[PDB]
Amino acid sequence: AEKPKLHYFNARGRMESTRWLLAAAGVEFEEKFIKSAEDLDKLRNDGYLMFQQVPMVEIDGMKLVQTRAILNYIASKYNLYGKDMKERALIDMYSEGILDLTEMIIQLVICPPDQREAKTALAKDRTKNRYLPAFEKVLKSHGQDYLVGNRLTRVDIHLLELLLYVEEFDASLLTSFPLLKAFKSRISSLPNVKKFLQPGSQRKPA
C-alpha cells in the first residue's frame, strides 16, 4: 500500500508527531492499532520491530522504528526538511528542543501521582523560561511566518503540536508570547492542518 501503515496503540503517545507530519503533508495513512499482547507479539515474532518496540511505520517497503528515524524520512520524502544541510541544522536544532519539552510534558502522566506535582512545576518553568522564549525570539528576530527558510517545514508542525499541548497543560503559559499566539493561529489555518484539527480526523485525544 502506498498509504503508510502506522502501528501503535490507539492513543497519542509516541506516534502522534508522525500523524501530525503526515497530515500536514497531505498524506493519507492507515492505522493498525495494537489491541492485544498477541498483536505486539506477532509484530515482534514476524521480525517487524528492530528493537521490539513501536511506533513502527510501514512505508516504501521499510519497517521503520524509532520516531526520529520515522520523522526524518517522512520530512525528507515530502520536502518538509528544508533545502540544504545548514537549513536542516536549524530545523533539527529547533525540533530537538521541541521534542525535549514535549517529552517532559508527556512524562507527567506516566510518572507516579506523588511526583507529578514536582515535575509539573519544573515542566511549567522550562516552558515559560527556557523553551517558549527561544521560539518567540526566533519569530521576533526575522518576523517571518515560518520558523526556518520563510516556508513551511516539519518544525512549524512540531511547534504547533507543542503549542496545542501547552494549551492543554496550562493555557496561561502562552499568554506572554504574542508571536507564538499568532504563529499558532497561522499554522492552524493551513488547509491540511485545518482538516487534521477537525473532529473525526485521526488526531488522537489527550
Q: Which does 64 bind (CB under 5 to 8 A by kind): Cl ion, a copy of itself, none?
A: a copy of itself
Tell whether 198 is in a known binding site.
Answer: no
Tell whether 53 is in a known binding site.
Answer: yes
3-state secondary structure (DSSP) of residue 62: strand
Query: Interface with a copy of itself by CB under 8 A: which residues?
Result: 50-52, 60, 62, 64-66, 68-69, 72-73, 76-77, 85-86, 88-90, 92-97, 100, 130-131, 134
C-beta of 42: minimal distance to a copy of itself in Å?
Answer: 18
What is the rounded distance in angstroms from the CA atom of residue 87 to the CA atom of residue 89?
A: 5
C-beta of 92: minimal distance to Cl ion in Å?
Answer: 6
> How many angstroms separate the first and last alpha carbons of the chain?
29
The long-range contacts involving 47-55, CB below 8 angstroms and separated by at least 24 positions, are 48/7, 54/7, 54/8, 54/9, 54/14, 54/15, 55/6, 55/7, 55/8, 55/13, 55/14, 55/15, 55/18
Q: Between residues 18 and 196, which has the closer beta carbon with respect to a copy of itself?
A: 18
Q: Are 181 and 160 in contact (CB under 8 A)?
A: no
From residue 49 to residue 78, the character string flagging contacts with Cl ion as x (rule: CB under 5 A) and all else as - is -------------------x----------
Q: Which residues are annotated as a binding site for glutathione?
A: 8, 44, 53-54, 66-67
Residues belonging to the binding site are 8, 44, 53-54, 66-67
